[PDB]
């Protein structure tokens, strides 16, 4: 409506998808699948599931770096994800393959003051739009955040136009960059 007879309310919605060849775009598909997209050809897929894809507890990070067949941007996003997570103490709760340049990671997720709170916190900060539907706690729950799903899987996929229930939104990743080294426990004497 017109305010003070002369001042009308007119709105503008930003077409956030047009930042696609410059920086990552995070969007949702449903309560499970949340798609991060680096460019217009490749991206990451974050899925909370009760079914696992990696059945072993090893993680060949150093050998993956030595061989170096993976994509640099996807590994950069996964590094930002794993560094941003708070109070990560149980090394056994993560697995990864990186087999022949693959990207697959699996955070074991099976209460308050556990690693699941950090995993879901990083997940909702990354994919901001779907946090309403991915999270079972509703609103007002911060410390004791914990979902019903038993694993958080990360894979690499292409762009099949899977952004539904939320528009492209780089706000999560861009905001999460500054959270990279805010909270990590010391792991050894010599840094």
């Amino acid at each position: 409506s017109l305010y003070k007879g002369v001042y009308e309310l007119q709105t503008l919605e930003l077409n956030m998808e047009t930042l696609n060849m410059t920086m990552p775009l995070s969007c949702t598909k449903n309560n499970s699948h949340h798609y991060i997209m680096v460019g217009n050809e490749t991206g990451l897929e974050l899925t909370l599931t009760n079914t696992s894809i990696i059945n072993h507890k090893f993680c060949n990070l150093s050998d993956a770096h030595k061989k170096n067949l993976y994509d640099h941007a996807l590994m950069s996003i996964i590094s930002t994800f794993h560094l941003s997570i708070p109070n990560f103490n149980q090394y056994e709760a993560m697995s990864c393959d990186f087999n022949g340049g693959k990207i697959s990671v699996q955070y074991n997720l099976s209460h308050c003051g556990t690693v699941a709170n950090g995993v879901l916190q990083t997940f909702m900060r990354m994919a901001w739009g779907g946090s309403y539907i991915a999270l079972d706690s509703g609103c007002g729950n911060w410390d004791c955040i914990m979902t019903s799903y038993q694993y958080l899987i990360i894979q690499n996929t292409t762009w099949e136009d899977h952004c539904q229930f939320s528009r492209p939104s780089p706000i999560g990743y861009l905001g999460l960059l500054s959270q990279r080294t805010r909270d990590i426990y010391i792991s050894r004497r010599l840094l």
Binding site: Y7, L9, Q10, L12, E13, L14, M16, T22, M23, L177
Partner: protein, 142 residues
């Protein structure tokens, strides 16, 4: 440090907004950008300007945005919006913004973000006091 990137009056092409309008803003709106820090708009303007400059003035890597994030945007504004999200305070996911258009001469204020809650854009009557405050501030033209 603080954001420092300057805007190359800024008009947003039809590509970078919905409904396909020029939405050319006045010089005063861009003038407010440099001083004000805690306003969600003038943050996306820097991102879109940097987008255009990077596309046109450089011949797919996310290292550039990693370098330039803190120089471009106020990350802690995004953090304030997230803190509003977790506390069940209405917040802004940087999607839709609103300005007061003066139809007599076409001058418009710097747009403020449309707050959200429970997966829905907030009712315009809920924050109408802020709209009246923006009207009153805009009446102080001289």
């Amino acid at each position: 440090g603080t954001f420092t990137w300057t805007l190359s009056g800024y008009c947003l092409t039809r590509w970078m907004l919905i409904e396909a309008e020029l939405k050319c803003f006045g010089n005063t709106a861009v003038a407010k950008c440099n001083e004000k820090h805690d306003e969600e708009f003038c943050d996306m303007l820097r991102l879109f300007d940097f987008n255009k400059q990077a596309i046109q003035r450089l011949k797919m890597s996310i290292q550039l945005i990693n370098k330039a994030v803190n120089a471009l945007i106020n990350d802690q504004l995004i953090m304030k919006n997230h803190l509003r999200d977790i506390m069940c305070i209405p917040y802004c996911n940087y999607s839709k913004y609103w300005y007061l258009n003066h139809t007599t001469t076409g001058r418009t204020s710097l747009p403020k973000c449309w707050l959200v809650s429970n997966g829905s854009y907030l009712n315009e009557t809920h924050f109408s006091d802020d709209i009246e405050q923006q009207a009153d501030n805009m009446i102080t033209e001289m």
